[PDB]
């Protein structure tokens, strides 16, 4: 994985260059965003179970997905689904804190689509739940932090589609 600083360093390193003005401007932006990111991480950590619970209630409960023939039917599958959502929220928070999506490529999306299609886990419904997570999260962390979390939750969704 890389965070936003290591990403800019690597772009310079592969050219054998010191960071130029444009590169330093990227670092300044990330350094300045520190308070935003740290506060949001604290809020999400404290409210992680509530965020997932509320997203599921909005997007999956009382639908075909939780009835026989749906992929959340059986307590075993229901709990596995919740666990996935816990994962997506935690890793999106990592990526938001890092200001970089690389941890998502490396540790979330790697082989995930194939795993879901082998198991019959519905992509459409998963993406709907992650989108619900985005909106619940935004209601708690505010507009500005909500936008950053939205980037990385959207990133996960795009990676599944």
């Amino acid at each position: 994985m890389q965070d936003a600083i290591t990403a800019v360093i690597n772009s310079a390193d592969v050219q054998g260059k010191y960071l130029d003005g444009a590169a330093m401007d990227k670092l300044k932006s990330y350094f300045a965003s520190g308070e935003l990111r740290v506060r949001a991480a604290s809020v999400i950590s404290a409210n992680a179970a509530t965020i997932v619970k509320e997203a599921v209630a909005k997007s999956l409960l009382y639908s075909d997905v939780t009835r026989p023939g749906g992929n959340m039917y059986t307590t075993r599958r229901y709990a596995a689904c919740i666990r996935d959502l816990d994962y997506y929220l935690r890793y999106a928070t990592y990526a938001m804190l890092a200001g970089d999506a690389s941890i998502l490529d490396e540790r979330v999306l790697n082989g995930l689509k194939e795993t879901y299609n082998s198991l019959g886990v519905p992509i459409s419904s998963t993406v709907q739940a992650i989108q619900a997570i985005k909106e619940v999260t935004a209601s708690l962390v505010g507009a500005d932090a909500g936008k950053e979390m939205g980037v990385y939750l959207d990133y996960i969704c795009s990676g599944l589609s």
Partner: protein, 162 residues
């Protein structure tokens, strides 16, 4: 950087970062302006820093530029000066990241295997970075030199051991 280190530890333990880890990240990110000033000062003064350093290095080790020495002849000597500029550049990466990681992954893992294969004396490299440190820190304020010294020291210590 400091941020990814926290995240890797958290991920290892299947958890969110702790309040303590988040406070550490907060503290690191407010020190950005200083790190950028240090990086730009070293970059701006690269030629002067490397020149002071190489003068001291080869006063100590003239045998490196004598026949049979690894830096004998202009092409080889110039490649030493090239390497000098590269390690100065890596130090600026370390200062910006707030840890040794960008120095280690680009310039230290396998460094002894490389220089042994090139017949460049690793104790010569230890001596080289020692006087590079002297030259670089001399152009910084007392405060900034203290911030920067550990990154040179990490290189020096790495090259002295194993």
């Amino acid at each position: 950087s400091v941020v990814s280190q926290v995240i890797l530890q958290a991920d290892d333990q299947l958890r969110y970062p702790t309040s303590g880890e988040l406070k550490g990240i907060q503290a690191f990110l407010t020190t950005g302006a200083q790190r950028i000033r240090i990086a730009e000062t070293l970059a701006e003064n690269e030629k002067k820093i490397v020149d002071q350093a190489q003068k001291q290095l080869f006063k100590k080790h003239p045998e490196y530029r004598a026949p049979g020495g690894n830096a004998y002849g202009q092409r080889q000597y110039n490649q030493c000066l090239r390497d000098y500029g590269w390690y100065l550049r890596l130090v600026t990466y370390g200062v910006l990241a707030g840890n040794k990681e960008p120095i280690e992954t680009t310039g230290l893992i396998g460094v002894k295997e490389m220089y042994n294969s090139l017949n460049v004396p690793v104790p010569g490299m230890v001596d080289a970075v020692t006087v590079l440190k002297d030259a670089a820190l001399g152009l910084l304020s007392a405060e900034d030199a203290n911030e920067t010294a550990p990154y040179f020291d990490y290189i020096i210590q790495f090259m002295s051991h194993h």
